[PDB]
DNA sequence: GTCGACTCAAAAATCAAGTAG
DNA sequence: CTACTTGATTTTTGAGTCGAC
DNA sequence: GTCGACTCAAAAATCAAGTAG
DNA sequence: CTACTTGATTTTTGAGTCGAC
């Protein structure tokens, strides 16, 4: 990972892996299938990665960092948490629609590496707990358990991403977009 | 698919029950039609007399589980003091039901992979029978503004069962139990 | 070669529940082998009997002829031969139980076993008879008499009851073989 | 069996079964094959019989009775056990050719109804033992385990019945009949 | 079937890409067979080339068992080369990999040419020159025209250039 | 290159590369092998050259220019195209007897850089085609296709260059030298 | 017989860290 | 009333096949 | 060579719906 | 400042191996 070319090649393999696993799955994807996509040598996969299941771990970790950083970009504004959660919900549906064909990796994760599947949620919840408890003491949001509410807010985003993002190409209507914002505002008094 | 004689209904159930325990224990792949029919104590071919494909057993396993969860939740909600108290124990007893049906979640994981259409159906039928319950509750003025509200409440139950019932294997504390009802109260009463 | 041997070990199943009640699923499951792998090694369910009875004929004729190979009087050959048969058949209870299944499922093999066994018997019997060792009778008829006695006591005292023959009973049988074959 | 018409029709089904099972085999014969030959309704078989296997149990119980009676007929005259056995053996092989059908079915039994197969030899040996043992006390035949001798004689009859009655329509030549008469004489006559 | 499935994919890939630019991974995937299945049949990657070359030498000997002769036999060689495209391309690769086979092939092609050439010189059919040289002139002409008009281009020669080639053969052989 | 001191080290690499690639082949030749032969630092090779494969491109560029100029010396000052080919052929073979190592690397090119290999024959044909078309109308050489006759002349040169130069080293005898000229003369005589 | 993951000795390409002119 | 009779409907049965890894 | 879903050609059981005695 | 130099260091290569069905 030291050299600029070194970190480039690692990203050639990783971006090749996400396309194949999202199309044919983990089982069907061979190391040859990956390196041939990346246009690199066969043994180069084993230079950057320990084994085949280790690519999924690194795929999930990037499909967490790249999401959380994207959401933190649109939530650097107003000190009020209700405003943070108002944008953080709609922009999550915007990002999931961009990475629509990339949810099939999670299905393949719950099968082959289910431990790193639990990790994505627990790490997302960890940054939704410490960041939520800040606004809690500030009396902006409800004084309850911070960890408990994190899963409630994630669970809503998860289910919406299933129905309006994955199970429908149409998405959300303007009236429903407004309706959603009040639901967030209501359970934060 | 073919329910005429009570013996046919008996044999279909011998198959369906064996499938439920086997898929839960070792998954859809590791379970063979021989495993299903041997445990059921019926002819190998008999599985095909009632089920077109091996995949079609997941369809009827989900249907039976969905209907039995819908009845379990319909039982504890028909008496309650308006919609605000309906979602109060509707969520509460779902987390109790999920610990009773802890072993049989392995099936629902497989569903998302092998038969994702009946996985999609599970939520869409539950949402269709939730929307009717919310449309006439807004008509009374008990709860705030339709279909979107159904999925939101589903996702709360879905994720809490995933974490506090499945992963933690302990449950919810008395403190956290009370905290839940407040989220329900604040989300339905216009504050 | 282990996979074919895993399949063949079939013997346990057919001897206990019988050829009919034994399925390919039963055989392949017990063997811890794929259903289809049975058909890679065997043409049909019936072909397994042929291969089992192939081993059964080999195991027997080799063991049974080891003790009769040197004795003086043919009466002593039969007295011992009978004892060594009932002894072998207790050691190979499974293989015989499968051989019994043949009379319905592969009758041509069953009929052949007895006929080929009669040929080995008649050969030696006709010989000693002409010498004056054995009663002068039809060598083929007497051959089936001793084959019948062996098969019946094998059924009753080995298969139908795991016990066997008592030392007292063994002497009684030895007397029966002697009395019958010794010319007056 | 309450009516005389009932007993009449049962025999129609029974006789066709004997004729068919003997000819084509137990597996090859269907209930339709029996009822059509019998010239009766398909379902009528089930009015008199529990299952296809249950008809074997009745065919063998008649086979045991009819053979035991025929053999009692000729063995009653002689009051010399060696002569009783000499005749009984010939008379058995005679009855065998006369009842090839019934005996051919008895062979199938060892695989389809092994319980009644074992039963026949056991019932036959029990009646044989008490007869031989009494004749041993009279000092007519050798003093050996009577049960053992019962099976020795039974096994001879059975095997000769296979080779010289089933496997070949020929039978025993006068030389072979005389030779067999000697084998039984030499074997039972004490020295 | 598996061993033959390999060779078909193996020949088609080594022809287009070349021995080095073709990996066992490329071969097995084109053949629709497991990676390890290659090593079950062939003990080495060098060994599969030996067999393709051994197969090519069989096809060459079969053709070699058959003034105007050098005119038609020239066009018949290029017609054979177009039908054996993939196999000749693998033979060109031998020059670097196993140079002994490349040298021997041309040397044996010279022997058969020379003996048949020296008989026509005596008869007065063709002009008196070195028989070893004249043969290599005809060999080189074939190898070059086949390299350009058959191997480097899928097109061909055309009846316009076909007649022009016979005019080249005639002029250099008839005085 | 910039300095005459720097350009001095570029030729130290090239004149060491030629000596190794022609001897033990491109594959067996390493950068550590080249740099050590040049008596320089490892990386210095990459300072003057893009990649290992690019050294082949420069060596063949020099090989192409050196031959184009050497043959020009003896053919530039001529009138008859038939005689241009006669001199051109003999001096081509004379050049390779001196430059054996340079042609050996051109053989390695077919396998490692077939792009520059196919370019050489395609550009050598372009020099011939232009020169032939001028002599076609002048009545010097025979009336055929210019591209066809270009490769024909190339093929005779290429083949002889392997057999009498690379494989034997013995070269052509004075009888063979004269016999060859007769072939080229006969070929291009418009009869 | 079939499979596809993982090893390993080579030798490329690339640096940080210097010195010449 | 019970005792037989009917055939079409229904359920049952493994062995053998098939394309896949 | 190894794997397991799936077809298939019969059958055995049923049972409503009757007729005989 | 630029042009050149140095060699350990980091990356790449794809054949051959490895168990396991």
Residue numbers in the entry:
A (entry chain F): 6 to 194
B (entry chain E): 4 to 148, 151 to 196
C (entry chain B): 12 to 20, 22 to 196
D (entry chain A), F (entry chain C): 6 to 196
E (entry chain D): 13 to 78, 87 to 195
How do the authors describe this structure?
To further unravel mechanisms of DNA binding by FadRSa, we determined the cocrystal structure of the protein–DNA complex to a resolution of 3.29 Å using a duplex DNA containing the predicted FadRSa binding motif in the control region of the fadRSa gene itself, corresponding to ChIP-seq peak 2. In each FadRSa subunit in the cocrystal structure, residues of the recognition helix α3 and the α2–α3 loop interact with the major groove of DNA with the establishment of an extensive number of contacts. A Gly48–guanine interaction and Asn37-mediated protein–protein contacts, of which the latter have never before been observed for bacterial dimer-of-dimer binding TetR-like proteins, assist in the dimer-of-dimer interaction mode.
FadRSa, of which we show that it displays structural similarities with bacterial TetR-like FadR regulators, is an archaeal member of the widespread prokaryotic TetR family. Each subunit displays two functional domains: an N-terminal helix-turn-helix (HTH) DNA-binding domain (α1–α3) and a C-terminal domain (α4–α9) of which α8 and α9 stabilize dimerization. The finding that FadRSa represses the Saci_1103-Saci_1126 gene cluster and that it is responsive to acyl-CoA molecules acting as inducers in vitro strongly suggests that intracellularly present acyl-CoA molecules cause a derepression and thus higher transcriptional expression of the gene cluster in vivo.
